[PDB]
Design an enzyme around this catalytic site. Structure first.
Site, short mmCIF file in Angstrom:
data_model
loop_
_atom_site.label_atom_id
_atom_site.label_comp_id
_atom_site.label_asym_id
_atom_site.label_seq_id
_atom_site.Cartn_x
_atom_site.Cartn_y
_atom_site.Cartn_z
N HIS B 39 78.73 66.23 29.54
CA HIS B 39 77.65 67.05 29.02
C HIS B 39 76.57 66.25 28.30
O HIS B 39 75.55 66.83 27.94
CB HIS B 39 78.15 68.22 28.17
CG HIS B 39 78.63 67.83 26.82
ND1 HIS B 39 79.95 67.58 26.59
CD2 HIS B 39 77.93 67.63 25.68
CE1 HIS B 39 80.04 67.27 25.31
NE2 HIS B 39 78.84 67.25 24.73
N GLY B 141 78.27 65.69 16.83
CA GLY B 141 78.16 64.29 17.22
C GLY B 141 79.50 63.59 17.45
O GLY B 141 79.53 62.44 17.87
N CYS B 143 81.75 64.32 19.73
CA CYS B 143 82.16 64.32 21.15
C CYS B 143 82.33 62.89 21.65
O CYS B 143 81.49 62.04 21.37
CB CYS B 143 81.16 65.06 22.02
SG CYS B 143 81.31 66.86 21.96
#
Lengths: 301, 300
Positions: B39, B141, B143
């Site tokens: 993503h 943030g 991820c």
């Protein structure tokens, strides 16, 4: 969510070495061209009852110390006593030495521990310096020399070097200047600590973290004066809260809209009524090993 | 006993940041490949229902900014594997440890290295819940932060972070990009199934109590695995598998308590209640039989 979180340990793993003197092996911390380690590495089991350390160290030479970084031997070219630690000068400098400072941490402050065995890092966990100057850690045989630290913008502040496990299962050690925290001594005896107290500022910071994370059940419509809170806190073996500590909670109070004294009134109710089967941030007891900084760093960034 | 993370240095040396446009997340750099959540290619008005195959068609090697600190690693290839991207870079990481990719099972524990902008910030232990979520601690943030275990200097990576569910628990994938649980990588409120207690770890906790001389709860009876599983499901406990019984082999031999004899003790605790075990009325379920051996006998 909210978790007990340690600093990433890599900057400290690159400093851990093994130190051997005779048949005793423990961990050392290698920074630049110096290895720091607990002085009792020079002792035999007989000496340990009443070791006259200056008298025992003058009898050793540089070649009495075997220092190893992994399977690579570091040659000792100088040695000196620094209170309860030894400073072993080695002929090579550690290129993995981070930017560092040595600090003597105050009771209530937290730090990460890198537990090591035979110079090999094994685990990393958070501890608080208790008001009675012990730490509630997890250390086994051969863990002496393991260190405690904090990291701020790539600078490692070393604050603890491990020496002892008391009969109660709590731990005792020194700062990196070699001074013990508390009334402990590096003699092989059963030592007791003074009576511990609960770190009030940390219990309050943790209740603010619960509010930030959507837990408001313990709140109430009441308030208290600072003195009336302190009378109850002292009755329950909690440290008194000073105006400086109320000030430290300022940012967490402004973020949540809960006045510090209103949170004190909630804690006063928790102390008098108990938690009665309920949990705050997953816990059934009031947690006191998260500082206001530990909460801010974990909830905001 | 306490939650202890593995020393994170071997994983810190693999953490990078990956940016596409203004979206930045973390990546894992092993040899000449960087793995990161797919993503990172989405915009803040594309995440609701992305067609990742079509979105990735509009991207080239030149669309990805991969950085180790502020040093750019040039991307020379890209492909998608389930919910991750595999970006080939022109530099093989010199800090790559010996490693494996493993898909962990419910009940297993692992360390998480929380990272932001490719910079590690904290390390803590997590258990994979039976509902396929972890009770972690992550901010915006995070991820691309990974979960792992270390056994004899080999890093087994098992988790890559992607989501925070409305309940506050977290969801992610293995290092092949396959989600643990029914979750999908899109900006939607997703619910986890009802969680259960990790039976294997409660048994490990009971063995850790026996190892420390706390053994009041042991009885003179046994049970079959089937009879235990049927009673366990009535108390919201996970059924035990043959692998779970085998995992308990070492603790059973050490204490001399047969696994099925310990299940009979736990069965009585469920049907009749608790008195403390290791100083508490609540049974801990986030310490595996490995975690117990590690803290009772310790590496050496």
């Amino acid at each position: 969510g909210f978790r007990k979180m340690a600093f990433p340990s890599g900057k400290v793993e690159g400093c851990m070495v093994q130190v051997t003197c005779g048949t005793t092996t423990l961990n050392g911390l290698w920074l630049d061209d110096t290895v720091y380690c607990p002085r009792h590495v020079i002792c035999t089991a007989e000496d340990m009852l009443n070791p006259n350390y200056e008298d025992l160290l003058i009898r050793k030479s540089n070649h009495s110390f075997l220092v190893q970084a992994g399977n690579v031997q570091l040659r000792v070219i100088g040695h000196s006593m620094q209170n309860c630690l030894l400073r072993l000068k080695v002929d090579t400098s550690n290129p993995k030495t981070p930017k560092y400072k040595f600090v003597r941490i105050q009771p209530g402050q937290t730090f990460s521990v890198l537990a090591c065995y035979n110079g090999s890092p094994s685990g990393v966990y958070q501890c608080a310096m208790r008001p009675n100057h012990t730490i509630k850690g997890s250390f086994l045989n051969g863990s002496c020399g393991s260190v405690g630290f904090n990291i701020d913008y790539d600078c490692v502040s070393f604050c603890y070097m491990h020496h002892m496990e008391l009969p109660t299962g709590v731990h005792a050690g020194t700062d990196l200047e070699g001074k013990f925290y508390g009334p402990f001594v590096d003699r092989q005896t059963a030592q007791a600590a003074g009576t511990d107290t609960t770190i009030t500022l940390n219990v309050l910071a943790w209740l603010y973290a619960a509010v930030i994370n959507g837990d408001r059940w313990f709140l109430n419509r009441f308030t208290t004066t600072l003195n009336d809170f302190n009378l109850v806190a002292m009755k329950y073996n909690y440290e008194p809260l000073t105006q400086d500590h109320v000030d430290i909670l300022g940012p967490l109070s402004a973020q949540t809209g809960i006045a510090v004294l209103d949170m004190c009134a909630a804690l006063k109710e928790l102390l008098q009524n108990g938690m009665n089967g309920r949990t705050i941030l997953g816990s059934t007891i009031l947690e006191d090993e998260f500082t206001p900084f530990d909460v801010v760093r974990q909830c905001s960034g």
